[PDB]
From TrEMBL:
<feature type="binding site">
    <location>
        <position position="317"/>
    </location>
    <ligand>
        <name>beta-D-glucuronate</name>
    </ligand>
</feature>
<dbReference type="Pfam" id="PF16862">
    <property type="entry name" value="Glyco_hydro_79C"/>
</dbReference>
<feature type="binding site">
    <location>
        <position position="88"/>
    </location>
    <ligand>
        <name>beta-D-glucuronate</name>
    </ligand>
</feature>
<dbReference type="GO" id="GO:0016020">
    <property type="term" value="C:membrane"/>
</dbReference>
<feature type="domain" description="Beta-glucuronidase C-terminal">
    <location>
        <begin position="364"/>
        <end position="452"/>
    </location>
</feature>
<feature type="binding site">
    <location>
        <position position="277"/>
    </location>
    <ligand>
        <name>beta-D-glucuronate</name>
    </ligand>
</feature>
<dbReference type="InterPro" id="IPR052974">
    <property type="entry name" value="GH79_Enzymes"/>
</dbReference>
<dbReference type="GO" id="GO:0016798">
    <property type="term" value="F:hydrolase activity, acting on glycosyl bonds"/>
</dbReference>
<feature type="binding site">
    <location>
        <position position="276"/>
    </location>
    <ligand>
        <name>beta-D-glucuronate</name>
    </ligand>
</feature>
<feature type="binding site">
    <location>
        <position position="28"/>
    </location>
    <ligand>
        <name>beta-D-glucuronate</name>
    </ligand>
</feature>
<protein>
    <recommendedName>
        <fullName>Beta-glucuronidase C-terminal domain-containing protein</fullName>
    </recommendedName>
</protein>
<dbReference type="InterPro" id="IPR013780">
    <property type="entry name" value="Glyco_hydro_b"/>
</dbReference>
<feature type="binding site">
    <location>
        <position position="155"/>
    </location>
    <ligand>
        <name>beta-D-glucuronate</name>
    </ligand>
</feature>
<feature type="binding site">
    <location>
        <position position="63"/>
    </location>
    <ligand>
        <name>beta-D-glucuronate</name>
    </ligand>
</feature>
<feature type="binding site">
    <location>
        <position position="270"/>
    </location>
    <ligand>
        <name>beta-D-glucuronate</name>
    </ligand>
</feature>
<dbReference type="Pfam" id="PF03662">
    <property type="entry name" value="Glyco_hydro_79n"/>
</dbReference>
<dbReference type="InterPro" id="IPR031728">
    <property type="entry name" value="GlcAase_C"/>
</dbReference>
Length: 456
């Protein structure tokens, strides 16, 4: 009983070109206490990253970046060698952790195995400028300028107070003075050090003035986004997660204006569904795959340079869960990122939906792939409506579909893409071949499902 909608692809309606390093992940800086985690020996986690993209960015930072201390003198402890640092829950101070040379050496090997680039947090909330300069120098020495994309000087400095790291009076002017002291110290040790900031959610009292003041000193603007609003908000449900988020649209417009004003591109350096490490029954469900895959394309269409989904440990919202000792597994959100991975890079095209007011949470994105083939990514985020999509504007002898599926929107497991789960070490191949019947094509999609179409 599907809602019958039209999708019109326009090869002449050119959007943004998706860069090859758009995808990415974000982790807590505390995880650097364990030299076995980001290590060339961690072949399982490296494989999960390679399946998400041949290029991509690993961001290390988060709330734990204010509680983590580089020590050039130190060696990892026995406890460090088993630490699994999941997303910080933001209720109280994180434990103090130490980063060692060995952990940085191992990170460099992990980046070589994955092919990903690095955004590395430095400790401006509690550390010293001179120790930041020393840490930056060792990271540059060992990771190298080609793989290091940016240092960041503090995570979410607008929330230092709420987290008890600065007094209530801390404001942009105070942070700018700290940023400049750190920047100057680091550039004495590392004259080519690249920076990004301010590593927080778009706002008018921090991110806009940061860009104006530091536009010649950073390579790009770094923003955060959680779909969950303030603690007072109508609480996050799956139903709400599938709906447009007007705050996201406004903050994105704000970042585009900053780019117009300053020349600085923007990257979403930390995002996930719900804050405080996620919400059980929302963040760890198949709805999060639909949400994440759709977000990747929404932000790419808006001109973002990339994204980094926060995670680690066994956090509710982590894309990849696990440890070196116990192994790693793809959680539901991973599968939305995997659909984006399989689509590949290229230039976005016009893809207009009609007759869709009874299926309003269906989204669609059309792509001219770098290999010249047209792809369409569809997210049927309607929880109660199947759709039948009449596709016009594509001329091809053959279309195939890979489906992103689970039996219920709130499933924590049972998620497949292309008729297969992801296996060990990120192993994935499609197991189900489905042609799209065809001028025009007609695609059915179940309620709460996704699809990737590829045309020959
Ligand atoms: O609250 C969250 O879930 C995240 C918010 N941004 C900072 C992260 O350390 C934290 O884990």
């Amino acid at each position: 009983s599907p809602v019958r909608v039209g999708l019109s692809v326009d090869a002449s309606a050119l959007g943004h070109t998706i860069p090859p390093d758009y995808t990415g992940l974000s982790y807590e800086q505390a995880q650097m206490a364990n030299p076995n985690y980001f290590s060339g020996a961690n072949t399982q986690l490296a494989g999960f990253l390679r399946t998400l993209g041949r290029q991509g960015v690993l961001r290390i930072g988060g709330n734990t970046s204010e509680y983590t201390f580089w020590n050039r003198h130190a060696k990892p402890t026995a406890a460090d060698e088993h630490l699994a640092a999941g997303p910080d829950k933001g209720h109280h101070a994180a434990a103090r952790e130490v980063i060692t040379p060995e952990a940085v050496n191992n990170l460099s090997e992990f980046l070589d195995k994955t092919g990903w680039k690095l955004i590395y947090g430095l400790n401006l909330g509690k550390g010293t400028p001179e120790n930041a300069a020393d840490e930056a120098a060792y990271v540059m020495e060992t990771i190298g300028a080609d793989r290091l994309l940016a240092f960041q000087l503090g995570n979410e400095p607008d929330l230092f107070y709420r987290n008890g790291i600065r007094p209530a009076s801390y404001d942009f002017a105070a942070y700018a003075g700290d940023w400049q002291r750190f920047f100057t110290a680091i550039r004495k040790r590392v004259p080519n050090a690249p920076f990004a900031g301010p590593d927080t959610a778009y706002n008018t009292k921090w991110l806009v003035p940061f860009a104006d003041k530091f536009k010649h000193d950073v390579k790009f603007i770094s923003s955060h986004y959680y779909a969950e609003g303030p603690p007072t908000d109508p609480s996050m449900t799956i139903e709400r997660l599938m709906k447009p988020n007007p705050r996201l649209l406004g903050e994105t417009a704000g970042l585009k204006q900053v780019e117009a004003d300053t020349g600085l591109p923007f990257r979403l350096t930390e995002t996930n569904s719900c804050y405080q490490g996620g919400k059980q029954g929302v963040s760890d469900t198949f709805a999060a795959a639909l949400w994440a895959g759709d977000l990747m394309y929404q932000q790419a269409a808006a001109g973002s340079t990339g994204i980094n989904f926060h995670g680690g440990g066994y956090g509710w919202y982590t894309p990849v869960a696990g440890t070196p000792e116990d192994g790693f597994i793809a959680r539901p959100e991973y599968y939305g990122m995997l659909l984006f991975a399989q689509a590949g890079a290229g230039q976005l095209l016009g893809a207009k939906l009609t007759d869709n007011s009874a299926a309003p949470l269906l989204t669609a994105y059309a792509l001219r792939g770098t290999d010249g083939r047209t792809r369409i990514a569809l997210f049927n985020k309607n929880l109660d409506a199947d759709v039948e999509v009449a596709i016009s504007g594509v001329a091809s002898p053959s279309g195939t579909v890979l489906r992103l599926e689970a039996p219920r929107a709130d499933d924590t497991t049972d998620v497949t893409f292309g008729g297969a789960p992801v296996g060990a070490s990120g192993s994935w191949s499609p197991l189900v071949q489905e042609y799209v019947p065809g001028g025009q094509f007609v695609l059915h999609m179940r309620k709460a499902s996704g699809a990737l179409l590829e045309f020959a």
